[PDB]
Amino acid sequence: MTRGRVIQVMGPVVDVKFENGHLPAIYNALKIQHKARNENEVDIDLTLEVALHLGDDTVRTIAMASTDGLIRGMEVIDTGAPISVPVGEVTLGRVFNVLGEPIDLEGDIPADARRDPIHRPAPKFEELATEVEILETGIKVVDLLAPYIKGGKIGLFGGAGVGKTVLIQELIHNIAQEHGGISVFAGVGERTREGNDLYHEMKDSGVISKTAMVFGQMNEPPGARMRVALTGLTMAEYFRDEQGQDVLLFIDNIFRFTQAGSEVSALLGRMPSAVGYQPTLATEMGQLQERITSTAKGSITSIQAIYVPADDYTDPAPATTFSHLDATTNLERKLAEMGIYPAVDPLASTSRALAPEIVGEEHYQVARKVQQTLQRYKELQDIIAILGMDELSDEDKLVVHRARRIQFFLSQNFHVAEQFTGQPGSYVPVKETVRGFKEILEGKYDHLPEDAFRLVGRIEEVVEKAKAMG
Amino acid sequence: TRGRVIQVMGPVVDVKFENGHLPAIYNALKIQHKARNENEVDIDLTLEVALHLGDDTVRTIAMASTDGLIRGMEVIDTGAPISVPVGEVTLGRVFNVLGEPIDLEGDIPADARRDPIHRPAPKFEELATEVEILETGIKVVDLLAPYIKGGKIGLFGGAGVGKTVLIQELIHNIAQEHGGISVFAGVGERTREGNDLYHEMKDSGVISKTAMVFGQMNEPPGARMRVALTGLTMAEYFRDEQGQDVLLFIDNIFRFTQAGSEVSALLGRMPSAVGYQPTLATEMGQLQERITSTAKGSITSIQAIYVPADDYTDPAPATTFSHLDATTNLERKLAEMGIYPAVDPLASTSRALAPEIVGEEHYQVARKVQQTLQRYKELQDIIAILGMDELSDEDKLVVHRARRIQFFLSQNFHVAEQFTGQPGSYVPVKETVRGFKEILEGKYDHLPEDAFRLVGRIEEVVEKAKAMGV
Amino acid sequence: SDVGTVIQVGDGIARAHGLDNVMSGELVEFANGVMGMALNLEENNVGIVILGPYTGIKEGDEVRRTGRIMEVPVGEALIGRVVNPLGQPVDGLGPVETTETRPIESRAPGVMDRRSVHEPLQTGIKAIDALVPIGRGQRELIIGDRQTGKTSVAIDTIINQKDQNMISIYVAIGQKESTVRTVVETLRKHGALDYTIVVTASASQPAPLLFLAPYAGVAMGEYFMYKGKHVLVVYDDLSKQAAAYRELSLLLRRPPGREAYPGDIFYLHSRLLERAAKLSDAKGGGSLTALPFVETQAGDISAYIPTNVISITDGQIFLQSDLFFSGVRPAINAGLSVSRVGGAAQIKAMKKVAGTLRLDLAAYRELEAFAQFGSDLDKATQAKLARGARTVEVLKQDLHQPIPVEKQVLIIYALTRGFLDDIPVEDVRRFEKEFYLFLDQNGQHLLEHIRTTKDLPNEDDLNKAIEAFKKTFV
Ligand SMILES: Nc1ncnc2c1ncn2[C@@H]1O[C@H](COP(=O)(O)OP(=O)(O)OP(=O)(O)O)[C@@H](O)[C@H]1O
Ligand SMILES: Nc1ncnc2c1ncn2[C@@H]1O[C@H](COP(=O)(O)OP(=O)(O)OP(=O)(O)O)[C@@H](O)[C@H]1O
Ligand SMILES: Nc1ncnc2c1ncn2[C@@H]1O[C@H](COP(=O)(O)OP(=O)(O)O)[C@@H](O)[C@H]1O
Ligand SMILES: [Mg+2]
Ligand SMILES: [Mg+2]
Ligand SMILES: [Mg+2]
């Protein structure tokens, strides 16, 4: 639209001076594309996001790509609008960077695609809906003791190396296998290794066309790692505003979204607060998570993983998100290093839709008996360690005898773990889950060896494995 | 060539050289003024350049108090750094930071050789290393963390822990044995201890083998900065040009860095860490690298380090910890307990605790001692909660022998005759190992624990137990 | 134009007039001949950091720009040498004579260029090989306090690569030079010097040099990877690199951050650590695996830099001084150390035995915490304690005595199946060494079966061979 010269470069931060006085708005997009005139110059193409107005026709911009080789006096052009990711049917089976440019070598998107600005005012109470709909995943622990909800936000909490990304991937796979719905996956500051693994797993599963992917890698400047989640959300918008269906949006690690925001604030000279966090923390978190709502048309249900640093949940980044969550799942390393997979703590995981009238009273009663037995077992293990299983009385003995089997049967083999153990994997219907747990609690299978329950799906698979072992 | 003073803020001054010539960094400038009237004060001052400012201006750290300075005073440029008198003349004498002598015994003529204090460190090819033990006669160091000849030795502690007692004991024994040139530089010490040490040396006659540079608490920060470098400069000549083995003693090195931090804010440096200057590690490594043993000569350097709040994790002690080869850390709890010196058995280390250096039996004895002490260290927390009657036989024996051991680590000292009125002792390494082997095997369980307190050799333990009447 | 005067000089930083066509990161040289990087471009001045001895520079000096980025000379002739961050020898022995040069600022291997990590990297440390396995391409972090056996693990790793075909690099940042010499002599005495390169950036060196040292190491690692050879890289301390970067940034007046660290810490360490990779069969299958080190105060794992580096890496090896002085060396906390490539970077018999070993250790880790205090216990409670004690004894090994994998898997097979029940705990340590000797002399066929097959030998042969040794042992 209009052009101005660079005046200052201080790493990611760049400053431009629009001499004539026509200034870009905040959150606008600026383009630098240069060709070397002398043998000492370099060729660079750069995207800059405006952040401030500084007076006397100067603006302060955060760069979305590495700023090396910038020269004062080189021309910047104004696009006239925010960073606009192309959206539509053209983005299925394709992988993009933050700027909405295809990472894949399968091709380049043409000018035909409709382009949606990443930064848009959040939906009003124009049509937001209060209705509650349960989403089935096929995982016994998750469906039984912490049901997820359409349009709701679900949180996965744990340390490093506990099982979050495997759970996210098998959620994607099972949703495509049974529900058949679209999904969108965005990685905030993702590792190249795990992103490559995810692409290869989706290609093997035949899912890549169902889902879409936006990648933001750690070696990129902080601003891109910040904005990648918003461009992924803008991709997810189209499939429920225009195509009007039940969408999912996955986010790799919001922790990095907060960290990148803090780092950008530091680069901009904003005064720190709390534990080094930026001044505008919750205004960013809320502006992210308040566009993820189910109107009458579509859900944009979200499942998210967030990293807790040191087994402490009081850090500002986990604390702010904890005020947005409809269901929360806590993953424990002690489970992860046991034979019980997936590592999901029954007692620490809760959902606001576990109400008896939402899930049905049979579901509620079965879940409540499950949790009661697990709590009694946790209490009794202290006595068992010192005095043994034989010291306690018959009621406690039967309680622990059922509790161990419940602990094992919560585990099940899944289709993404084929790499790790060479076993196929299973899906369990929700009514089958509740019926099996009801039969276990009622004790129809007291005679079976406890090993049969270790990693199978339906209870008849326990019967088959018991037949196999002998 | 002359420059005019234009600013003065405590330690720092701002000369302006408008003649068309400017001094380099680290140079020395002179002020000599005659009072024109009864109001003016006659002043004799020298200033070292520390930073170049913009318009014919430099920032200069004053070497002495700045009272009486008038804006518009005239400053002479010497054209070279601070010069120190180098040679055999330094032996016996005591000097200040600028190179003049402090004792009234005489003066040093113009013909003496003088060297600048600032120069680059030795290169990688020049260094050499060895493993030879340097016996101290101190049971703790000899048995748990042996010092090594030619290796850097560090004493870490806060105020009032036993640092200078150890410095004096080591200097007494080593100067009794070694035929080495010695240089003693006191940085930020008590000016009373300098006189006391001078008189003790005159009693010992070692003063002819020693050269001393003194700058203490009552001095402006610049002298506190440069004093250790002056002492090192003398040790440099003795190590290299004479090719004679030298010892360098510095007590409470820290004040070198502290003086730099104090004037750092006056020099326009943004704060860092806990108030420290940004350039901490550069300067500390710059000092420490010049103190090395080459093939031309060897320096055995024994250093004491002070912690501002007794927090070992403080930046300054943390940076220094990487430059040492043997460290004894003294902390207040042992001083409170009455066991002396206050060296921590489980946090003091040396590069010499290896069977290829000290032998198999010595290494096994030391490691077994440390294991017993760690077992008691956890057992204190266990016993506090449960009591002392719930432990088993072996757990009780651990406490018994740990109590017997940490007392025997206490020794009757020579220089502690004033403080406690006892003769003192020198314990050979073989006797320490024999006694500790007797202790660990339970050969002296019957003796009461008081018999083991503040004695040299296990025979004195038996004598004290005989005195107790057992 | 290109000519301009210097208006300020101090602490290894300068500012200059002119230079209106300079570029960010461009190398700049003074009349003194020392070189420096232009890092800040302002409306009428340039901020320059000096890569050398700066005391000679004065106000009014004219300054010039080279026109290039910093290039590290790269060749096969560097192996065995000791070098600076710059391409200049400091070991004597004359010029290294490299082939050519590479810019150090480069983009990393991207997505779809990488295969899954499947081939092991062998350290010879029983605990790490069994319970925290590593593969070529993995970015495993080793983190701990002072004096808890950190660099002994890197030296053990580099020494063991003699049997394999690895290329290794050791980068020392901000360390004392005599420590570099001691490590070089330790390596040379064990013969490892010919397949290694040592890069030295001591603390005395000007701060910008320590800023460039890790990238200096990766530049050579990348050349060797793209040729197609496997590479192992060790950074001895990223903490000192962070300190040097903070000092350089503060002198430049860039706005501070959490612990006064600048806002570019994560950007810099990620730019550094994303170059490690495992390349595809199309590229050539080369691999640049990295083992960065981080040390931080008093076991507080929760600081800024430790958490950044923990968030960037694929695993952590946690070293505790508490465990060191308890008689368990090298002191590794198996519980707190995370392995994300556990079963994929192991040989088949290692997977098979090590899964059960980790099950035993995890079972023991909780019961031991409190059951010992109650002297009276049920019969079966104490058995697991005994098993865990024998496990922790079996995982201990002397300094600089690395082990081939097959003897590890043999002794761990002996452990897991309960063959060590008769042996009192003290005899267990000697049992391992005498068992190794007996298998070397008598049961060589098992070693041959594992060496050829890469799989566990027939159970009957293993049982007979292990049982035969127990008869001699007393
Ligand atoms: N071996 C010992 N036996 C008895 N008392 C001792 C012994 N060592 C030290 N002390 C006592 O502890 C005091 C410690 O004083 P010292 O000069 O050693 O302190 P420091 O550790 O150097 O501290 P500072 O840094 O404050 O100068 C001595 O004055 C003396 O009273
Ligand atoms: N298997 C082992 N058995 C006994 N001692 C060991 C073993 N492995 C390492 N050590 C000891 O542990 C120490 C490790 O020294 P090293 O300098 O490598 O450690 P570091 O943690 O990197 O040190 P620093 O914090 O001082 O830099 C040495 O004293 C060495 O003797
Ligand atoms: N069902 C499972 N069975 C065995 N291992 C698993 C399973 N799910 C995840 N893992 C382990 O998790 C690791 C993968 O990392 P992951 O836990 O998904 O990342 P995150 O650090 O986000 O939790 C692998 O080492 C794998 O062994
Ligand atoms: Mg993950
Ligand atoms: Mg003192
Ligand atoms: Mg080191």
Task: Write the residue with the smallest CA distance to atom 21 of ligand 3.
Answer: A161
Distance CA A194, CA B153 (A): 48
Task: Please tell me whether A298 is known to bind a ligand.
Answer: no
**DSSP of C401-417, one letter per residue?**
----HHHHHHHHHHHHT
C362 → closest Cβ in A11, A217, A338: A338
Whether omega before C330 lies within 30 degrees of 0, making that bond cis, reads: yes
Q: Give residues with Cβ within 8 angstroms of A209, minimum separation 6.
A: A92, A93
Residue spans of alpha helices (H) in B409-452: 417-420, 429-440
Q: Give residues with Cβ within 8 angstroms of B355, minimum separation 6.
A: B362, B363
- Tokens encoding B181: 């040139």
Contact A115, A85 (CB under 8 A): yes
Query: Looking at ligand 3, which atom is closest to the CA of residue A162?
Result: 23
CA nearest to B89, candidates B64, B66, B72, B106: B106
Distance CA A149, CA A131 (A): 10
Q: Would you put residue A98 in left (φ > 0), alpha (ψ -120 to 50) or beta?
A: alpha
Distance CA B13, CA B49 (A): 9
Catalytic residues of A: 164, 190-191
Task: Write the residue with the smallest CA distance to atom 10 of ligand 3.
Answer: A163
CA nearest to B150, candidates B290, B250, B248: B248
Distance CA A408, CA A427 (A): 16
Under DSSP, the state recorded for A405 is H
Q: Please name the residue that has the structure tokens 């720190």.
A: A272
C256 CB neighbours in chain B (<8 A) are 270
Task: Write the residue with the smallest CA distance to atom 3 of ligand 1.
Answer: B416
- Helix count and strand count (H, E) for chain B: 14, 16
Catalytic residue among C340, C365, C390, C451: C340
Under DSSP, the state recorded for A220 is S
C22 CB neighbours in chain A (<8 A) are 71-72
Q: Do chains C and A touch (3 or more CB pairs under 8 A)?
A: yes
Q: Is the dihedral of CA A376, A380, A381, A382 positive or negative?
A: positive
Q: Would you put residue C183 in left (φ > 0), alpha (ψ -120 to 50) or beta?
A: alpha
Distance CA C138, CA A382 (A): 39
Q: Give residues with Cβ within 8 angstroms of A384, minimum separation 6.
A: A392, A400
Q: What is the dihedral of CA B185, B188, B190, B194, to 10 degrees?
A: 10
Under DSSP, the state recorded for B349 is E
Contact A412, A455 (CB under 8 A): yes
Closest chain B residue by Cα to residue C298: B313
Distance to chain C for B415, nearest Cα, Å: 32
* Ligand 1 lining (C-beta closer than 6 Å): B 157, 159-165, 252, 306, 340-341, 413, 416, 419-420
CA nearest to A214, candidates A244, A175, A252, A164: A252
- Tokens encoding B253: 């090195």
Distance CA A21, CA A18 (A): 6
Task: Please tell me whether A120 is known to bind a ligand.
Answer: no
Strands B28-33 and A301-307: unpaired
Query: Looking at ligand 3, which atom is closest to the CA of residue C342?
Result: 25
- Tokens encoding C315: 């695993």
Contact B62, B36 (CB under 8 A): no
Distance CA A220, CA A67 (A): 11
Return the exposure string of A370-400: e unless at least 16 CB atoms fall within 10 Å of the residue's CB, then b: beebbebbeebeeebbbeeeeeeeeebeebb
B52 → closest Cβ in C59, C82, C180: C59
Element (H, E) at B213: strand B210-215
Q: Is the dihedral of CA A274, A277, A279, A282 positive or negative?
A: negative
C91 CB neighbours in chain B (<8 A) are 124-125
Under DSSP, the state recorded for A75 is E
Distance CA A377, CA B238 (A): 76
**DSSP of C262-302, one letter per residue?**
-TTHHHHHHHHHTT-EEB-TTTTS-EEEE--EEE-GGG-TT
C263 → closest Cβ in A219, A267, A390: A267
Closest chain B residue by Cα to residue C182: B129
Task: Please tell me whether C188 is known to bind a ligand.
Answer: no
Please state, as a whole number, how many other Cβ atoms lie within 10 Å of the Cβ of residue A461. Answer: 18
- CB proximity under 8 Å: B 383-402 to C: 386, 390, 392
Task: Please tell me whether C150 is known to bind a ligand.
Answer: yes
> How buried is residue C95: exposed, middle or buried, by Cβ count under 10 Å (0-12/13-18/19+)?
exposed
Distance CA C85, CA C81 (A): 13
Distance CA C303, CA C300 (A): 7
- Tokens encoding C442: 């008598």
Residue spans of alpha helices (H) in A220-253: 222-241
Report how this structure was experimentally obtained.
Answer: cryo-EM
Three-state secondary structure call for residue C326: coil
Contact A329, A344 (CB under 8 A): yes
Query: To 5 degrees, how large is the angle CA A131–CA A134–CA A136?
Result: 155
Q: Please name the residue that has the structure tokens 């002191």.
A: C331
**DSSP of C161-212, one letter per residue?**
TTTTT-EEEEEEES--HHHHHHHHHHHHHTTGGGGEEEEEE-TTS-HHHHHH
Under DSSP, the state recorded for A417 is G
Residue B73 backbone dihedrals phi, psi, to 5 degrees: -70, 155
Q: Give residues with Cβ within 8 angstroms of A467, minimum separation 6.
A: none
> How buried is residue A144: exposed, middle or buried, by Cβ count under 10 Å (0-12/13-18/19+)?
buried
- Tokens encoding A226: 């910040």
* Residue B224: C-alpha distances to residues A170, A258, B251, C10, C124 (Å): 66, 45, 12, 21, 51
Q: Do C55 and B26 touch (CB under 8 A)?
A: yes
CA nearest to A251, candidates A230, A265, A271: A230
Distance to chain C for B273, nearest Cα, Å: 6
Amino acid at residue number B89? V
- Tokens encoding B79: 């054209």
Distance CA C396, CA A127 (A): 66
CA nearest to C413, candidates C329, C355, C362, C453: C355
Contact C284, C229 (CB under 8 A): no
Under DSSP, the state recorded for B323 is T
Query: To 5 degrees, how large is the angle CA A318–CA A321–CA A327?
Result: 105
What is the maximum alpha-carbon separation in chain A? Answer: 89
* Residue C443: C-alpha distances to residues B166, B205, B340, C163, C447 (Å): 58, 70, 56, 21, 7
Q: Give residues with Cβ within 8 angstroms of B304, minimum separation 6.
A: B154, B155, B156, B157, B163, B164, B166, B167, B250, B251, B252, B253
Q: Do A259 and C266 touch (CB under 8 A)?
A: yes
Contact B317, B353 (CB under 8 A): no
Contact B145, B348 (CB under 8 A): yes
A161 → closest Cβ in C315, C358, C381: C315
The partner residues of A273 in beta bridges, in order of sequence, read A277
Q: Give residues with Cβ within 8 angstroms of C312, minimum separation 6.
A: A218, C139, C266, C269, C270, C273
Distance CA A24, CA C437 (A): 78
